């Protein structure tokens, strides 16, 4: 117990460097800070609470009746709805160990690059899939129209076709039948283009999930490579 012991005390580290020092942590993870003075950061209810320590006349407290005259007795008093504190954030967490902090960062950046060389080919794949999904929908409706066009033929025609047969004109009906046959041909041709596009659909649906699996394997690593490359304050132009 002193002014700075290095057990649960940091300087005026910002609020950006507190939430992440106790993010998704249990009811307890706490630390002492400074105010615009002292500050106490605490965790409970799945939330981050903030309590000020009034220091006037070299004495410290929370409520109106002051019950301390030092900084570190305050913590141990309540430590053992003012729920107790549990787990503190230590200061010493892992000769001139500075050069080694390239090998552990060189992973991250490269593993970021390889993830970027994947998320790109995820987005590009992803949208490419939706495209094909719509094109099949287009083909389907296109086919319907031609199938409706056939209905228009085998209805308007079957009054002329079954009028020239009772009049003797085969190679006039041969023109009509040549037309109807090309119409049906342009139906089967569309159906086959659509079947091929469904083949590419399932090709890309497998490639998509392979990309997703590789991303799911890579992701746990990058977060752990984030905490390994933390910097030391006060030093300039380390590469």
């Amino acid at each position: 117990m002193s002014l700075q012991d290095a057990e649960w005390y940091w300087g005026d580290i910002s609020r950006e460097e507190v939430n992440e020092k106790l993010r998704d942590t249990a009811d307890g993870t706490f630390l002492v800070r400074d105010a615009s003075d002292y500050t106490l950061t605490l965790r409970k209810g799945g939330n981050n609470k903030l309590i000020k320590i009034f220091h006037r006349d070299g004495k410290y407290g929370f409520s109106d009746p002051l019950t301390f005259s030092s900084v570190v007795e305050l913590i141990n008093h309540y430590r053992n709805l003012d729920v107790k504190l549990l787990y503190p954030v230590s200061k010493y967490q892992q000769e001139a160990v500075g050069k080694k902090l390239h090998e552990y960062n060189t992973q991250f950046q490269e593993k970021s690059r390889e993830y970027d060389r994947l998320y790109e080919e995820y987005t590009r794949t992803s949208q490419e899939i939706q495209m094909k999904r719509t094109a099949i929908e287009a083909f389907n409706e296109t086919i319907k129209i031609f199938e409706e066009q056939c209905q228009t033929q085998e209805r308007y025609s079957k009054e002329y076709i079954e009028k020239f047969k009772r009049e003797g004109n085969e190679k006039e009906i041969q023109r009509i039948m040549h037309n109807y046959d090309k119409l049906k041909s342009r139906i089967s041709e569309i159906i086959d283009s659509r079947r091929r596009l469904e083949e590419d659909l399932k090709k890309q649906a497998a490639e998509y999930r392979e990309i997703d699996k590789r991303m799911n394997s890579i992701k746990p690593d990058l977060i752990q490579l984030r905490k390994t490359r933390d910097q030391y304050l006060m030093w300039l132009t380390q590469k």
Binding site: R15, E16, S36, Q149, C150, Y156, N216
Partner: protein, 1020 residues
């Protein structure tokens, strides 16, 4: 599903000049016909029915008039092409075929729905197919606001319609700051009213000297008097002349379409105030009221075709803790390189209400939990904004990781509480998101049903639960001294100022007093414990009877930190009563972005905004574009599209002008797609050759001439001055476009309209920046500080696609150095800027131009410091010939704080300190210290403090712009930058030392360093 490319056929950007088109005739005959890519449907139909008489069953073909073309578009719908002026390539066909049918059904409905669908970028039929009851209830009900707005439009049949189309462009207050009042002659201004006398335009002037605060009718009266002076009339006869013909005319701005329709002071009109400040003379035009109302459409509103005992206990009756079952998950893309678990949690906006509970670690390959999770929270203690954020995570214990997330509103839009079985398709995780849940993430099931689909079963009670009506909450609600020094100090601290638990309970305790100082309501609400029906019920009753606060402060209650419905209802009511149309336009970006946060489709905020958009076309236009520019994002697509459907089904005849704008932008997108993709590696000479070739084609000329500039629909875009149009050097392949101004007297304002169309970069940054610059210039001018900024227009119209106003006769300092020439000197010499300004401003013009330069430079410097904008060298700062400075390329927020690693900003070298110090006070080798530099400094200091005084506003602006997934605007930690530049923690007089120190440092660091011209590296 909207189409993916702006091509003319599926997977082809441009149709070859001649295309084979399979025509399906109405007698069942298929005829392949060669058409020109630009050919209209009229001629295609004519040459079809001509060459179709060669094919059998030719006698059945009726007159070609009685048939219409139908086809399949790239959106995969059957478009019946009723407009047969449309060209083949503009059809947006899936494949080149055309079916010929006879018209069926109601033609009007088909046409209107097709126009709405084109405007949105999504066929309207897709909404009809949606089965969610909330969607259809919104679609049906929102028409109430639509009808109310159109009724207010036809309330005053002739005049109100004109007010809707051409609303008065005025400032908020008529009070004219004194340094502006002095600029005019003893309280009055010189004005010039013009009259067009015959068709092949002759023009006559009437130079009036009028009180600056006169209404338009009074100006018309003075013009009539001017004319009825040469007239021979009695004194009472002149009196009767004016009396009868005062309000038979109306005033318009010469050169654009802004009209003075309302009884306002002339100086309150933005154009005239601008004329005063800039010293330019206002040129207006007289116009007969009949000659305007004639050109109004009389657009009506007709309803669409979709306008077509159960046991219930209240939530205040249930005694149990919230519990939910986690059944199973359809599939997970796991490599088996490791066990997964479902982490859940109940949240009230950003923060969770209770403690987050998890499922058990299960096989990665086989995903089943089937476990009834209990939540540490009381069911009646649930606020109205309670909702469930959950996610599927993995393990190696050693290294956790999220995979697929999902959020659900725990109540219905009907107020019912969820119970029984439910299936939720999950969403993916953003690129750089490592959080175990997604709280701010959008609520609802995934429309894409192919991604991971979780299944679960909520607790089913005896009957159907509902959240209690407000009266029950009031019934529940019905159960000193002097610490005010603090309340008038914590209510003045910025929103991001820490809220200690001492202060939280100190506020909640003395809450019934807070009403006296109403602006403290934001802070107060943050100090409430929302998982307590007790405190929630009390706070509800405090909210209802709360004093209306200023609108700028009420906006805060609409950002993410305040999700409770009563809070947002209060803010919305505040806006409905106290917000001016002017500032509603001013802050529209944030207001649109904030719609995302609201729980349900139908709410008070959307109704308010839609009503004001259907009441004011200057709002409605940008309302439309801001919503449409986000239809690319699926997370917002449905909400924003339904809202766009609502607007387009009511705005009336402006819809067609919007369609023209859309059409033109589509063609531009497609052209730039070609320049960027297919012709990527072609030389610029050949790309410009192609550009000329393709623009001259008639589909383009017709589609991109004669329409309203989305940047400011008060400007008409006339004919393209093609000889000026060009592709810009920028790698992203922009398009410099030049239009004539078609205005009857384009001579008196815009000669040329020049716009940059860039397909590549995200503009939301630039937009927000320029909006803030605009706000700052407003603040400085209201406080009598004449710092002339240039917040040039900028509008994002789609995913990294937008428009940029050009400033006429401006040049980069890079240019001015080079453009000014070598003049015999390979080096610009840095002095040159001063001599180029001196070469374009001689005599007495010199001093006033120098004043313009310094006044603009100071403001832009201060703004570049307060906002995190770096990268300021001779290629981002521009000068006009009159000498106004202004900055461009506002690409990065908060000093690249997200970017890189975060160990810089200890030193920043400004390159051009000397180059400006020469202009700001001429000559004198020691211009480190001159009187003029002292005045420059005082200006900068006053400006810095002026922004610091209003800081809360800008904090709120940035906090509202967190809905947009902007690069350097993701967490509040980002926004916290301006807290440091302004030094809101340090006292007012300590912050001036902060500013002066930073500025001195940068100036001297600039004196030393070397620029290395092109690459702008250093040498020290």
């Amino acid at each position: 599903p909207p189409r993916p490319s702006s091509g003319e056929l599926w997977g082809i950007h441009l149709m070859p000049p001649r295309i084979l088109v399979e025509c399906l005739l109405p007698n069942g005959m298929i005829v392949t016909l060669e058409c020109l890519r630009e050919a209209t449907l009229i001629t295609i139909k004519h040459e079809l029915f001509k060459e179709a008489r060669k094919y059998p069953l030719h006698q059945l073909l009726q007159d070609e008039s009685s048939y219409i073309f139908v086809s399949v578009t790239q959106e995969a719908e059957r478009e019946e092409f009723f407009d047969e002026t449309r060209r083949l390539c503009d059809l947006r066909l899936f494949q080149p075929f055309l079916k010929v049918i006879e018209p069926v059904g109601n033609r009007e409905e088909k046409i209107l729905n097709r126009e709405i669908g084109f405007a949105i970028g999504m066929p309207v039929c897709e909404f009809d197919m949606v089965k969610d009851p909330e969607v259809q209830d919104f679609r049906r009900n929102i028409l109430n606001v639509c009808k109310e707005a159109v009724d207010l439009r036809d309330l005053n049949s002739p005049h109100s319609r004109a007010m809707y189309v051409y609303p008065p462009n005025v400032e908020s207050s008529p009070e004219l700051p004194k340094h502006i009042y002095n600029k005019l002659d003893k309280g009055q201004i010189i004005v010039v009213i013009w009259v067009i006398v015959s068709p092949n335009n002759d023009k006559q002037k009437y130079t009036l000297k009028i009180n600056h605060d006169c209404v338009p009718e009074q100006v018309i009266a003075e013009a009539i008097r001017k004319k009825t002076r040469s007239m021979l009339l009695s004194s009472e006869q002149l009196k009767l002349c004016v009396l009868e013909y005062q309000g038979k005319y109306i005033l318009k701005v010469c050169g654009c379409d802004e009209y003075f329709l309302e009884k306002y002071p002339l100086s309150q009109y933005k154009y005239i105030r601008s004329c005063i400040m800039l010293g330019r003379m206002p040129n207006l035009m007289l116009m007969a009221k009949e000659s305007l109302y004639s050109q109004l459409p009389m657009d009506c509103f007709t309803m669409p075709s979709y306008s077509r005992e159960t046991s219930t206990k209240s939530l205040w009756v249930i005694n149990s803790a919230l519990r939910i079952k986690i059944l199973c998950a359809t599939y997970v893309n796991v490599n088996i390189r490791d066990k997964i678990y479902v982490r859940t949690g109940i949240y009230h906006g950003g923060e969770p209400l209770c403690d987050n509970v998890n499922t058990q670690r299960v096989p990665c390959s086989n995903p089943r939990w089937n476990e009834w999770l209990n939540y540490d929270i009381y069911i009646p203690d649930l606020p109205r904004a309670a909702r469930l954020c959950l996610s599927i995570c993995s393990v190696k214990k050693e290294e956790h990781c999220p995979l697929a997330w999902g959020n659900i509103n725990l109540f219905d839009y009907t107020d019912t509480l969820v119970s029984g079985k439910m299936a939720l398709n999950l969403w993916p995780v953003p690129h750089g998101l490592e959080d175990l849940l997604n709280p701010i993430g959008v609520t609802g099931s995934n429309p894409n049903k192919e991604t991971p689909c979780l299944e679960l079963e909520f607790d089913w009670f005896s009957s159907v639960v509902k959240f209690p009506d407000m009266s029950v909450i009031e019934e529940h609600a019905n159960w000193r001294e002097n610490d005010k020094e603090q309340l008038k100090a914590i209510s003045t601290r910025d929103p991001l100022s820490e809220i200690t638990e001492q202060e939280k309970d100190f506020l909640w305790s003395h809450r019934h007093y807070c009403v006296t100082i109403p602006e403290i309501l934001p802070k107060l609400l943050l100090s409430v414990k929302w998982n307590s029906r007790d405190e929630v019920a009390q706070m509800y009753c405090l909210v209802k009877d709360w004093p209306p606060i200023k609108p700028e402060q009420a906006m805060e209650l609409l950002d993410c930190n305040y999700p409770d419905p009563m809070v947002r209802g209060f803010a919305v009511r505040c806006l409905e009563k106290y917000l001016t149309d002017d500032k509603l336009s001013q802050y529209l970006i944030q207001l649109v972005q904030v719609l995302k946060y609201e729980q349900y489709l139908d709410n008070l905020l959307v109704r308010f905004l839609l009503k004001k958009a259907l009441t004011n076309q200057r709002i409605g236009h940008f309302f439309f574009w801001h919503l449409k520019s986000e239809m690319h994002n699926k997370t917002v697509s449905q909400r924003f599209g339904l809202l766009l459907e609502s607007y387009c089904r009511a705005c009336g005849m402006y819809l067609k002008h919007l369609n023209r704008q859309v059409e033109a932008m589509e063609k531009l997108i497609n052209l730039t797609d070609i320049l960027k993709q297919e012709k990527k590696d072609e030389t610029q000479k050949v790309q410009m050759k192609f550009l000329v070739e393709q623009m001259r084609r008639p589909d383009f000329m017709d589609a991109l001439q004669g329409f309203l500039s989305p940047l400011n629909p008060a400007h008409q875009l006339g004919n393209l001055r093609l000889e000026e149009c060009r592709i810009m050097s920028s790698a992203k392949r922009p398009l410099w476009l030049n239009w004539e101004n078609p205005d009857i007297m384009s001579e008196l304002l815009f000669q040329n309209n020049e716009i940059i169309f860039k397909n590549g970069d995200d503009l939301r940054q630039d937009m927000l920046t320029l909006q803030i610059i605009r706000i700052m210039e407003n603040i400085w001018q209201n406080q009598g500080l004449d710092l002339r900024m240039l917040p040039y227009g900028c509008l994002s119209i789609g995913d990294c696609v937008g428009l940029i106003e050009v400033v006429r006769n401006s040049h980069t300092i890079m240019q001015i150095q080079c453009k000014g020439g070598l003049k015999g000197a390979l080096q610009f010499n840095s002095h040159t800027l001063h001599q180029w300004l001196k070469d374009k401003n001689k005599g007495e013009i010199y001093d006033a131009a120098i004043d313009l330069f310094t006044r603009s430079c100071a403001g832009y410097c201060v703004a570049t410091f307060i906002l995190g904008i770096g990268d300021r060298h001779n290629s981002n700062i521009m000068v006009k010939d009159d000498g106004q400075l202004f900055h461009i390329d506002f690409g990065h927020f908060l000093d690249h704080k997200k970017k890189k690693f975060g160990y810089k900003r200890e030193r920043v070298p400004f390159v051009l300190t000397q180059d400006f110090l020469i202009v700001i006070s001429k000559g004198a080798q020691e211009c480190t210290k001159t009187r003029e530099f002292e005045r420059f400094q005082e200006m900068c200091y006053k400006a810095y403090l002026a922004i610091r005084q209003h800081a809360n506003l800008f904090i709120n602006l940035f906090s509202m712009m967190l809905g947009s997934g902007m690069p350097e605007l993701q967490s509040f930690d980002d926004i916290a930058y301006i807290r440091k530049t302004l030094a809101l923690d340090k006292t007012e007089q300590e912050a001036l030392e902060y500013f002066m120190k930073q500025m001195n440092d940068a100036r001297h660091g600039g004196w030393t360093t070397k620029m290395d011209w092109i690459f702008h590296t250093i040498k020290q």
